[PDB]
Amino acid sequence: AKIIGGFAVSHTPTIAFAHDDPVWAPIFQGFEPVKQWLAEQKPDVTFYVYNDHMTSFFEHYSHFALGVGEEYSPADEGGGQRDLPPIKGDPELAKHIAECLVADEFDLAYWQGMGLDHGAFSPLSVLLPHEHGWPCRIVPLQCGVLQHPIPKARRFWNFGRSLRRAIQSYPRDIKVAIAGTGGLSHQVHGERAGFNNTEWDMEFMERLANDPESLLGATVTDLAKKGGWEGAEVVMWLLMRGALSPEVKTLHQSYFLPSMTAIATMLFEDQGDAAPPAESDEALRARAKRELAGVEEIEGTYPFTIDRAVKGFRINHFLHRLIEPDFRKRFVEDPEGLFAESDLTEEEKSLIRNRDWIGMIHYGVIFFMLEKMAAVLGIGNIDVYAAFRGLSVPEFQKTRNAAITYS
Amino acid sequence: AKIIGGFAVSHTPTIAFAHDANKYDDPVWAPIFQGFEPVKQWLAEQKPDVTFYVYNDHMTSFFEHYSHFALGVGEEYSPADEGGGQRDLPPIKGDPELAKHIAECLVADEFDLAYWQGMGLDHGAFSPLSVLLPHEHGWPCRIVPLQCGVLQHPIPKARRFWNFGRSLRRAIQSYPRDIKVAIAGTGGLSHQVHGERAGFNNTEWDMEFMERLANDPESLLGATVTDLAKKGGWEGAEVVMWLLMRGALSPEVKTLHQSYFLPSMTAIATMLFEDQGDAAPPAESDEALRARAKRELAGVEEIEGTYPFTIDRAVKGFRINHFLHRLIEPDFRKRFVEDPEGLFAESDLTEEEKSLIRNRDWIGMIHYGVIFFMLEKMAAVLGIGNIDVYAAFRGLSVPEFQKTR
Ligand SMILES: O=C(O)c1cc(O)c(O)c(O)c1
Numbered sequence: 001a002k003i004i005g006g007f008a009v010s011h012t013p014t015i016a017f018a019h020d021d022p023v024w025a026p027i028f029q030g031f032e033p034v035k036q037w038l039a040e041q042k043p044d045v046t047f048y049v050y051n052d053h054m055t056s057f058f059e060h061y062s063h064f065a066l067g068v069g070e071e072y073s074p075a076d077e078g079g080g081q082r083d084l085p086p087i088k089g090d091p092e093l094a095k096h097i098a099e100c101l102v103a104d105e106f107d108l109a110y111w112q113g114m115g116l117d118h119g120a121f122s123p124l125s126v127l128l129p130h131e132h133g134w135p136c137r138i139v140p141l142q143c144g145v146l147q148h149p150i151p152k153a154r155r156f157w158n159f160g161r162s163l164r165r166a167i168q169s170y171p172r173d174i175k176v177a178i179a180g181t182g183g184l185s186h187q188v189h190g191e192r193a194g195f196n197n198t199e200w201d202m203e204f205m206e207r208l209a210n211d212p213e214s215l216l217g218a219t220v221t222d223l224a225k226k227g228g229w230e231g232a233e234v235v236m237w238l239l240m241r242g243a244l245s246p247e248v249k250t251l252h253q254s255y256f257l258p259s260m261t262a263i264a265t266m267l268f269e270d271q272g273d274a275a276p277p278a279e280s281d282e283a284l285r286a287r288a289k290r291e292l293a294g295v296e297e298i299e300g301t302y303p304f305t306i307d308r309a310v311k312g313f314r315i316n317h318f319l320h321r322l323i324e325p326d327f328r329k330r331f332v333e334d335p336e337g338l339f340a341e342s343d344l345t346e347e348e349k350s351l352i353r354n355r356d357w358i359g360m361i362h363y364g365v366i367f368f369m370l371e372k373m374a375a376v377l378g379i380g381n382i383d384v385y386a387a388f389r390g391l392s393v394p395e396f397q398k399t400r401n402a403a404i405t406y407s
Numbered sequence: 408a409k410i411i412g413g414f415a416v417s418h419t420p421t422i423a424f425a426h427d428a429n430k431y432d433d434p435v436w437a438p439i440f441q442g443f444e445p446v447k448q449w450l451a452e453q454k455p456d457v458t459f460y461v462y463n464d465h466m467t468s469f470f471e472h473y474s475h476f477a478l479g480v481g482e483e484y485s486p487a488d489e490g491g492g493q494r495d496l497p498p499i500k501g502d503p504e505l506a507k508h509i510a511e512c513l514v515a516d517e518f519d520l521a522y523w524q525g526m527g528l529d530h531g532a533f534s535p536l537s538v539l540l541p542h543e544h545g546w547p548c549r550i551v552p553l554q555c556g557v558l559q560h561p562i563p564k565a566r567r568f569w570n571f572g573r574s575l576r577r578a579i580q581s582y583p584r585d586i587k588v589a590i591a592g593t594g595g596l597s598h599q600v601h602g603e604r605a606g607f608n609n610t611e612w613d614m615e616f617m618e619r620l621a622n623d624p625e626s627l628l629g630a631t632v633t634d635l636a637k638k639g640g641w642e643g644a645e646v647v648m649w650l651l652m653r654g655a656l657s658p659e660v661k662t663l664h665q666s667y668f669l670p671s672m673t674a675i676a677t678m679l680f681e682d683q684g685d686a687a688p689p690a691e692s693d694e695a696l697r698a699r700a701k702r703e704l705a706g707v708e709e710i711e712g713t714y715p716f717t718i719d720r721a722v723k724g725f726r727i728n729h730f731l732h733r734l735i736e737p738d739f740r741k742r743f744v745e746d747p748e749g750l751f752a753e754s755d756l757t758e759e760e761k762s763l764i765r766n767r768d769w770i771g772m773i774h775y776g777v778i779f780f781m782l783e784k785m786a787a788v789l790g791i792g793n794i795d796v797y798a799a800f801r802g803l804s805v806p807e808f809q810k811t812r
């Protein structure tokens with residue numbers, strides 16, 4: 001319910017290839033005014049804004065993909081999975097922001113179970129004591145900055161403005177940290193590959209702390225030019241800085257340009273507000289809940305909200321694979337071998353084994369995986385409907401105008 | 408540039424099913440198919456070049472990663488597997504150009520999108536398409552599928568679907584090419600297909616909502632999910648997708664057709680609309696729009712050795728980028744090293760895309776249409792560092808290049 005402040009930090013696979021000297025040591029302590037501040041505050045959760053560099057987001061690619069799931073392992077980036085402990089997520093804070101954001105006409109994606117690559121883990125494993133677990137929980141916002149067109153900077157800034165008061169209206173009194181990673185001036189493709197611009201970096205940083213809104217007119221061009229093509233991903237800093245106070249105070253501001261990137265780092269301390277907010281936090285809580293208010297009075301109905309998807313995820317994911325003609329062939333011949341290899345708990349196993357249709361709907365399975373499972377078992381949709389209504393298929397077809405069957 | 412009209416239709420898998428079984432003959436399905444004919448033939452006469460196609464996917468191609476407005480930008484689309492194998496239907500061609508133009512306009516109008524390709528279409532798409540268009544090897548037109556995340560709540564507000572169609576019109580209308588575009592809205596009508604409530608319908612609501620959608624759509628925009636699903640069943644609330652297509656037609660439309668059948672779980676319904684032009688020139692011009700639409704990559708052309716990864720690039724790039732993306736699989740990892748020709752002979756890349764890789768032609772891949780992060784994976788897979796890559800991008804040698812600080 002309260003925002004402690006947000007760190008802007010480069011994410012780079014070189015901070016992770018090596019870490020994991022005359023040239024390194026000066027930036028490792030341009031960093032830790034905030035192993036420090038992440039450890040005296042010890043945030044409950046960190047809203048983490050980053051960019052997947054075409055590892056877990058490619059064939060289907062989103063502009064603002066909120067992470068909603070329980071844990072996040074290291075994405076295998078082509079160099080094997082980096083030995084790190086799975087860091088926890090925060091589904092109910094994830095859910096709550098999704099409700100405020102959609103309510104304020106931001107179109108999200110939601111994702112679960114996919115690796116986090118160096119976009120997240122490289123600066124993390126240097127800001128955070130990651131020896132057996134990580135000191136806080138994570139709400140990853142994966143932005144879509146690589147495949148144009150992409151949201152305008154003003155759209156980034158505004159998302160941040162909404163996100164902030166989405167975190168403020170959260171009913172649990174915890175503290176949250178923001179993190180808009182990425183940047184700064186660099187290009188890593190084309191004949192321009194090596195470009196930098198430190199005359200811009202310094203202006204963008206001083207302006208991004210004391211006057212961000214003068215950055216709201218910047219097109220991709222102005223950005224691509226003043227900082228490299230890939231350096232325009234600092235739209236994600238205008239996101240992060242959006243969710244902080246109007247006025248703030250930089251209690252740190254390091255910067256060093258070694259090999260590939262301008263590696264900078266801005267630490268913000270959240271002041272209070274510019275005034276009370278226009279709409280109260282309960283009236284915001286009211287508005288985020290309006291679309292599904294009193295859905296509880298509908299019976300025999302199990303809304304597939306984020307919380308149900310997280311609870312359902314392992315059995316859902318498992319049953320989703322029936323679309324693979326090879327998975328679904330073992331499912332019929334050697335169901336146990338499939339079970340033993342799964343990561344399905346034992347009631348989940350029983351539910352499928354028993355073909356307990358109504359039980360899966362209660363438990364969290366979404367119908368359309370059962371549609372698939374029915375079809376794989378050569379029993380139609382109708383038998384599932386019948387079994388939902390505790391009726392025999394003939395007693396159920398009596399309730400329809402005609403008796404058709406289908407797969 | 409020309410929007411001719413728009414139709415609405417259920418995408419029940421029964422339609423697909425009754426088709427493949429060829430039941431244009433039996434008591435039950437015979438009148439239902441006859442309800443599709445007015446849309447069928449309107450399509451066969453108007454001959455649109457593109458159907459922009461609003462549908463929903465049913466946890467097939469969209470599960471572990473799940474977006475609201477997901478624009479198919481790719482070049483062609485095959486039927487998905489739903490646990491029983493792909494149906495027997497030709498792929499259907501896409502329209503990456505118009506997809507790219509629309510993408511452009513919609514982001515300008517502050518719609519956060521997703522782009523996707525390579526992925527099958529499930530009964531959401533091919534169930535009514537199989538019955539509305541002829542297809543013994545060859546669909547009569549192209550499509551731009553818009554896949555809507557209507558299943559995992561919260562989803563966009565009803566007014567946000569409407570508003571989408573509203574920008575979608577101006578975008579489509581502003582496309583600098585003389586083509587006929589039709590607009591499809593699929594899903595519904597009343598039905599609920601999970602839980603103890605399964606079997607629910609409401610014919611009264613279906614009829615109130617279709618006439619309202621037709622003759623007074625803005626009256627629906629305040630509708631919440633709880634309204635829609637109390638009135639129309641849980642999965643019947645997917646009719647916000649009819650709002651969206653209605654959103655991209657004229658304020659007034661000629662409703663040429665309407666049919667209703669309720670054989671089983673689903674109210675199988677259809678509406679054909681004829682577009683009636685704009686009865687007053689709009690508050691932003693076709694040229695003013697296009698300007699505002701490339702606005703942010705305006706003058707990008709003048710930047711040396713910069714190759715933006717726009718959607719035309721991504722579509723050009725897709726087969727090689729997909730091949731180079733599989734290097735995160737540890738099995739694909741090592742065949743790429745132990746038997747590259749075996750991996751090449753099994754792939755679907757042109758011979759040129761193969762050579763560009765065999766050569767490790769770093770800078771020739773960047774201009775072919777390969778994104779750098781796909782090479783960043785390729786370099787570290789094969790032993791090469793990124794150090795030589797950046798240099799090759801400039802023509803410099805590994806030791807000459809490092810001259811920087
Ligand atoms: O059983 C049906 O009539 C039905 C099944 C579906 O999977 C579906 O998406 C639908 O709209 C209707």
Ligand SMILES: [Fe+2]
Nearest residue numbers: 051053182233
């Ligand atoms: Fe990045």
Ligand SMILES: [Fe+2]
Nearest residue numbers: 463531594645
């Ligand atoms: Fe549907």
